Structures are given as C-alpha cells and as structure tokens.
A paper describes a structure:
The specific and covalent labeling of the protein HaloTag with fluorescent probes in living cells makes it a powerful tool for bioimaging. However, the irreversible attachment of the probe to HaloTag precludes imaging applications that require transient binding of the probe and comes with the risk of irreversible photobleaching. Here, we introduce exchangeable ligands for fluorescence labeling of HaloTag (xHTLs) that reversibly bind to HaloTag and that can be coupled to rhodamines of different colors. Here, we introduce exchangeable HaloTag Ligands (xHTLs) for the reversible fluorescence labeling of HaloTag7 with rhodamines, opening up new possibilities in bioimaging for a powerful labeling tool.
We then developed a second reversible labeling system with different ligand specificity, using a HaloTag7 mutant, for dual-color microscopy with xHTLs. Specifically, we mutated the active-site residue Asp106 in HaloTag7 to Ala (D106A), resulting in dHaloTag76. The loss of the interaction of the (trifluoromethyl)sulfonamide of xHTLs with D106 resulted in up to 57-fold lower affinities of dHaloTag7 for these probes compared to HaloTag7. We then found that primary hydroxy derivatives with different alkyl chain lengths (Hy4 and Hy5) displayed up to 108-fold higher binding affinity for dHaloTag7 over HaloTag7. Hy4 and Hy5 also possess fast non-covalent binding to dHaloTag7 and, coupled to appropriate fluorophores, fluorogenicity comparable to S5 probes. While the chloride forms hydrogen bonds with the W107 and N41 main chains, the water molecule occupies the space freed by the D106A mutation and interacts with the W107 and N41 side chains. Both chloride and water molecules form hydrogen bonds with the Hy5 ligand. Hy5-based xHTLs showed higher binding affinity than the corresponding Hy4-based xHTLs, which was required in the case of MaP555-Hy5 for selective staining of intracellular dHaloTag7. In in vitro titrations, probes based on Hy4, Hy5, or S5 had >50-fold higher affinities for their cognate HaloTag variant, whereas T5-based probes showed lower specificity. Furthermore, both PAINT and STED microscopy can be performed in dual color using pairs of xHTLs together with HaloTag7 and dHaloTag7.
Residue numbers in the entry: 3 to 295
Write the structure that this text describes.
Amino acid sequence: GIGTGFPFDPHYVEVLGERMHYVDVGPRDGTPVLFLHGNPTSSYVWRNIIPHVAPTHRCIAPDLIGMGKSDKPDLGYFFDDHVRFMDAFIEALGLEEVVLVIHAWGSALGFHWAKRNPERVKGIAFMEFIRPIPTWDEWPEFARETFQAFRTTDVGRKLIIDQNVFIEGTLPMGVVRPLTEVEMDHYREPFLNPVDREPLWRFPNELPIAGEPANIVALVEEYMDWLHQSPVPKLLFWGTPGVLIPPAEAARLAKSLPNCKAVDIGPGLNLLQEDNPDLIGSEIARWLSTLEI
Ligand SMILES: CN(C)c1ccc2c(-c3cc(C(=O)NCCOCCOCCCCCO)ccc3C(=O)O)c3ccc(=[N+](C)C)cc-3oc2c1
Ligand SMILES: [Cl-]
C-alpha cells in the first residue's frame, strides 16, 4: 500500500523574518534535489518519492510560506510572495547548483527560478505543471464551473476559506485512487483555522487562464519560451486524463521541448505523486544517474 506516514525530522530556517520548514535527507555531498509542492499540498506530497532518491542524493523539500509546517505571515500569498520567500529560502540554505523536482504551483516557482538562474539548474523533473490556459475551454470540463467560482471574492472565498472546499473536495478530485483518512488529516493539518486558508484561495486566483491575471500569464509565457529552447535536461511525468496537462499535450511537449524524456504513470489527475509514487521516484533516481551532477 502507498505510505501514509511522514517520518522526516523537521528542519527550520529563518527566511525574511519567517520560519520555513523543510525536509532535508540524504548524503550531504553532491548536487541536491529540490522538491517544490503546490496547492493545497506540502512536502507531504513528496513523502513516497523522496525515499527513492535519498539513498544517492540530498533531498530538500520546503513547505511554501503559509503552508505545511512553515510560518503563516499576514500576507496576500500572491505568486510574487511565494517567489520572494522561495528565492530567499534557496539562498539561506546556501544552495549552488540544483536539480529541480516540481509540481503544479511548485512548477511555476521552479521554472521561474530556473529561467532567472539557468546556470544553477542541472535538470528539471516536472509533472502536471502550469502553462497558460488560453480559454476556459482548455480547462477540464468536470472542474470548469468550480474554478470559475473560485476566482471570485464572494463565492470563491465562501467555498475555499469558509468551507475548506479546496482541501475537502478539490484535493481528492485531483487524485484517481481514494485518499485515506490519515492522508486527508495530514493535508488538513495546516489549515484547521479558516484564517489560515488565504493561500488556498489566492493560488487559483493566480492561475493563468483566459489572459488573467495578465502579469502571471506573461511570467508563465516567459518561462515556457525559455523551456522550449533551453538545453536543460527535462523529465516529464504525465497521467490519464490529467488536469493541467492532458496526455496529448504531454506527448507534444516530449517532442517539442529539447532533451525531454516523458514517462506515463498510468491513471492520474493532478497529484500524480499520490497515484504512482514508486514509478515517479524510481524514474527520477534513474534519470539523475544520466546527468552531469
Ligand atoms: C462543504 N461544502 C460546501 C462542499 C462543497 C463541495 C464539495 C465537493 C465538490 C468539489 C468540487 C470541486 O472541487 N471541483 C474542482 C475539482 O478540480 C479538480 C482538479 O483540480 C485539482 C487541483 C489543481 C491545482 C492546480 O494548482 C465541485 C463540486 C463539489 C460538490 O460536491 O458540489 C466535494 C467533492 C468531493 C469530495 N470528496 C470527499 C471526494 C467532497 C466534497 O465536498 C464538498 C463540500
Ligand atoms: Cl490553484
């Protein structure tokens, strides 16, 4: 059965006046592997993937500011806030060159950091990642009216902040296999208090859909422009039917993006880590062995 525990010792670092929590396992020398989660998850989403990589490589998995075991400042939790705190996190750990393993909103953070710091990125493994969604027709039909309602300050905040729907409903609807009560309690833990749910609502309001917000659309277009030409080694995981990346898109990207290998994980929606963690971790471990790190 897929593991439900989170055995990792807590590590904390002060970042811009705030304490950020991170997993830090594996050997201390060599190039580290930095794991970035998205909405509404935490380093918990990497718990069954990291044990495949940690025998041979350092694994660092931070909880984004306002999420997981990290501190909860009184912020808007805009994408720009996450960019500021992640930039500062990476410098606080003194990381030099890295391999990135990134997912969904963590993929926007990772690709935006890689585009700005390409000399420091030796490879990117990614899955269910953020690209511009040009019209609402390109958002999955089964989740279209709900994400449209999320992108409002009235209904959207009622659902996500008052009623915790991103945790109770959107999260399980992002996994094909059923989540256990223990797993759901791990995802619920950072957000038991409704006043702490601001990141859960601002994230879907930042998604680059139908041209808004224009500033995020532009930023995401920029790192996609880079990714289509950069020689950086790329490993793309995808599932069927997917959410942000449908199978036909994954197959086109595997051909268009330079130096990109694609791996079919089988059934999957958004949190591919919850549907086939052993294939994702074992393929990352094999792919790392082919990099000059
Ligand atoms: C308390 N209260 C008002 C509600 C309301 C609605 C529900 C809903 C629910 C959910 C939705 C809903 O979230 N759709 C969007 C799905 O997007 C999936 C793809 O993105 C993944 C993340 C991508 C991130 C990218 O960055 C719609 C409609 C409903 C409904 O029932 O009306 C629940 C659904 C499932 C459930 N259990 C335990 C399995 C329990 C549910 O419980 C509910 C409770
Ligand atoms: Cl989101």
